[PDB]
Every structure is written in C-alpha cells, then in structure tokens.
C-alpha cells in the first residue's frame, strides 16, 4: 500500500474503501427562512448546496451519503428531508439532536479549575496574571448562571460556524457509528468503528472517488490563498471512528480554557498527533497531510459567496 514520512516517522497509507460514507453538514440557525414544507438546506443560485449533495449522491450511487442537519425545523421541513431520503436511496439524513455526545463532554468548571490551579502555582512575578483573571471571570460567570455548563452545552448556545465546527469533529469521532446510532437502515458495507469522509457542501464531486490511501488513514483540506496554505476543516477524511488525531484535538479542547473546534480540535489535534511542532515545517506537514482528489472541485463558495460569512 505504501507509506509516507513526516518528522522521522513513517506512516502507512491506509485505505478508505469506496463504501466509506460521505458526510455533508447543514446546520440552519433560521429555518423559518425556508418554506414550511421545503427542504431546509440552502439551495440558492449562489449556494446550490442541496443540489450539490444530490449530485454527489447520484455519482456515488453505491456509497452511503450522510447529511448531518440541525436547527429548529418545522414538522413539514422534516418530512421534506424524509422525502429526500426516499428519492435517493443512499442519502441518510441524521438529526444532530438524535445523537448522544456526552461521552465527549466535560464541565467548563472543571476545565477552568484545572487551568487556574496550574497558573496559580506559578508565583505572582511570572504568572500570566491577565489570563488567570479571564479564566476566573469565566468560571465565576459559569457558577453564577449555569454551574453545570459543559463544552457541549456551551457550544449549543454559540450559533454559527463555531457550533457546527464543534459538532463536525464530534460526529467524525463517531464515524460510521453515527449512522448506526441514528438507526439508518441499509447502509451498505458500513461497519462499526468504520470511517467517514466529511465534505463541505461546496466541494463538488465530478466522478467517483474510489478508494483513498491516507497517512494513518486521515487527511484534511489544505487551502491555498494568495501564496499561503493552511490546514482546513472543509474536508476531513478518517478511516475509523475515534481517530487518535481527532481524539487529541478533543483532548486539547478539554484542557484549554478557550478551545477552538477548528484551531484546536482539528489543526491542533493533527499537529500534535503527527508531531508537527512549531519548530517543524508547516508547509511540509500540509503537503504530507493534504486531502487530494482530481474528482473534487474544492471550496466553490469562494467563487461566489460564503453561505455564512
Ligand atoms: O448556515 C450554515 C453555513 C454553513 N454551514 C456549513 O459550513 C460549510 C462551509 O460553507 P461555505 O463553504 O459556504 O463557507 P466557507 O467556505 O466560506 O467557510 C457548509 O458546507 C456547511 O456544512 C452550515 O452548516 N450552516
Ligand atoms: C474550504 C474550508 O476549509 N472551509 C471551512 C468551513 O467548512 C468551516 O466551517 C470554516 C470555519 O472554521 O472554516 C473554513 O472556511
Ligand atoms: Mn466554502
């Protein structure tokens, strides 16, 4: 199968076979902008994401296609989604609220208290006095209004990319298991502990993906703007659930007072897992870890307009 090297460690290229499900995500924070019986997934002329999901489902006829949705949909919008599932056998709509994420959760007061103890152990002359005060204010705010506030409940409140970025990582930790948890029947060759290929709805398929070969079975989008490249979470491919790199990102989220689902849960998890230290070469890590496929036209929203920026 081969292997690829980074930072003196050789990682086998593990296969994601052609039955690894694709995952699209659509979190709608104002579903009343859609018809009461319309499919609550944007499908404008500028952002034809529903059509893009349909088309990928038509190309990958044999592949399971998850659509993780969330929002306060009307009963009729949910029936519309159900009608979608019956039009395209391989499309499986999963309601985020139907999934149990508590095994990944942690109380904010415990995160805060853990950081306070470490920082307070440093004497006043060298400690980050500003940060310590910010964490104390955060903890105090939690204890005054919602002492059982946790990572999950806290992100539940923060509508926007921060929240759907957060659940994207948690769903990928479940991997194929999420389809089984959600009770989606007839997912061909889907196995517990199996993986998943997440794609932004503007990542256009133009042909079958076939089998992927990724270093330790993971790869992510690497975006290029001007002359720069950055790790991105617009594509996340894992060959298994609980991928140790995404788990490390969750661990970072569990120890950092202000963990970002993208910066820490994805970029941070990948870099620690592969030991891409601030001393190592970031461009070398990007090339090593990049998700590449000639049959995906990537981040097409940048050609028109973002759906949320
Ligand atoms: O209201 C929104 C906007 C975006 N997204 C998700 O965010 C992804 C990225 O969307 P887009 O490409 O428009 O944003 P950008 O590339 O500018 O970050 C989409 O595919 C969806 O999965 C979402 O769930 N709800
Ligand atoms: C092409 C790409 O990487 N898009 C991602 C998007 O999916 C994500 O939600 C957003 C916020 O973290 O960052 C990036 O724009
Ligand atoms: Mn985009």
Numbering used by the authors: 27 to 335
Structure paper excerpt:
Three highly related Salmonella effectors, SseK1, SseK2, and SseK3, orthologues of the enteropathogenic and enterohemorrhagic Escherichia coli T3SS effector NleB1 (7), translocate via the T3SS into the host cell. Similarly to NleB1 (9, 10), SseK1 and SseK3 are N-acetylglucosamine (GlcNAc) transferases that modify the TNFR1-associated death domain protein TRADD and inhibit activation of the pro-inflammatory transcription factor NF-κB, as well as necroptotic host cell death. Here we report the structure of the Salmonella arginine N-glycosyltransferase, SseK3, in its apo and ligand-bound forms. The SseK3 catalytic core domain (∼250 residues) shows the classic features of the large glycosyltransferase type-A family of enzymes (GT-A) consisting of a single module composed of a central parallel β-sheet core flanked by a number of α-helices.
The structure of SseK3(14–335) at 2.20 Å in complex with UDP, GlcNAc, and Mn2+ was solved by molecular replacement using the apo-structure. SseK3 contains the classic GT-A DXD motif (226DAD228) that coordinates the divalent manganese cation in an octahedral geometry. The last residue visible in the structure of SseK3(14–333), serine 332, translates 17 Å from its position in the apo-structure to interact directly with a β-oxygen of the UDP. The N-acetyl α-d-glucosamine in the active site is stabilized by a series of interactions that involve the anomeric C1 hydroxyl group, at a distance of 3.6 Å from the phosphorus atom to which it was bound, and the guanidine group of Arg-335, with hydrophobic interactions also established between the sugar and the aromatic ring of Trp-334. The GlcNAc C4 and C6 hydroxyl groups in the structure of ligand-bound SseK3 are locked in the active site by the side-chain carboxylate of Asp-191, which may explain why UDP-Gal, which has a C4 inverted stereochemistry compared with glucose, shows the lowest affinity for SseK3.
